[PDB]
Amino acid sequence: NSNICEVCNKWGRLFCCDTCPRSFHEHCHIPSVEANKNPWSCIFCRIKTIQERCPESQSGHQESEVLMRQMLPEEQLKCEFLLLKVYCDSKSCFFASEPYYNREGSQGPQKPMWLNKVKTSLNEQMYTRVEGFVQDMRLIFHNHKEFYREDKFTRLGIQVQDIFEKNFRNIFAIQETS
Numbered sequence: 001n002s003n004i005c006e007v008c009n010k011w012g013r014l015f016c017c018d019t020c021p022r023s024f025h026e027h028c029h030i031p032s033v034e035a036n037k038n039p040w041s042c043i044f045c046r047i048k049t050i051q052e053r054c055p056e057s058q059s060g061h062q063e064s065e066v067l068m069r070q071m072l073p074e075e076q077l078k079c080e081f082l083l084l085k086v087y088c089d090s091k092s093c094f095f096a097s098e099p100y101y102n103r104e105g106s107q108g109p110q111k112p113m114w115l116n117k118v119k120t121s122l123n124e125q126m127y128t129r130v131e132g133f134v135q136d137m138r139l140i141f142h143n144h145k146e147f148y149r150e151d152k153f154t155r156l157g158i159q160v161q162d163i164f165e166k167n168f169r170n171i172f173a174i175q176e177t178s
């Protein structure tokens with residue numbers, strides 16, 4: 001196994017996957033690394049199994065159909081994995097914890113949103129459709145763009161949104177377009 005967390009790239013108290021060489025901090029894995037379970041298989045491994053069980057699941061999909069899917073166990077897992085892929089980028093730090101807004105010439109968003117809030121909402125099974133999760137995720141970046149206006153810090157929201165969107169298209173096998 002690797003000697004650093006796959007998500008935050010630091011050493012520490014690491015749980016090792018039994019079916020691949022990745023390792024994780026307890027609360028860096030999503031869901032949090034399960035108490036017992038020997039062998040244990042990471043989310044990466046669980047996602048790859050879904051694909052292997054149903055090879056046709058990789059054929060292209062329309063975004064509108066994916067959003068309307070109910071949050072059954074496989075879709076729950078795919079959203080957890082997508083959330084984890086965003087935490088994998090170090091720029092996710094800016095979006096992880098609860099924000100506050102006090103900048104001359106700007107007003108805070110009407111509905112603040114942040115990664116740890118989405119993480120708790122997934123854990124608490126608060127989303128009934130993929131659309132709920134995706135809407136909260138895109139709201140994080142949209143709030144940031146609107147609040148920061150012409151400050152160059154706006155770019156951090158474009159960057160992390162791009163990570164989200166690329167992973168969304170990969171995980172949910174969105175039909176490729178120009």
Ligand SMILES: [Zn+2]
Pocket residue numbers: 005006007008009010024025028
């Ligand atoms: Zn970690």
Ligand SMILES: [Zn+2]
Pocket residue numbers: 017018019020021022041042043044045
């Ligand atoms: Zn694994």
Ligand SMILES: [Zn+2]
Pocket residue numbers: 053054055056
């Ligand atoms: Zn099948």
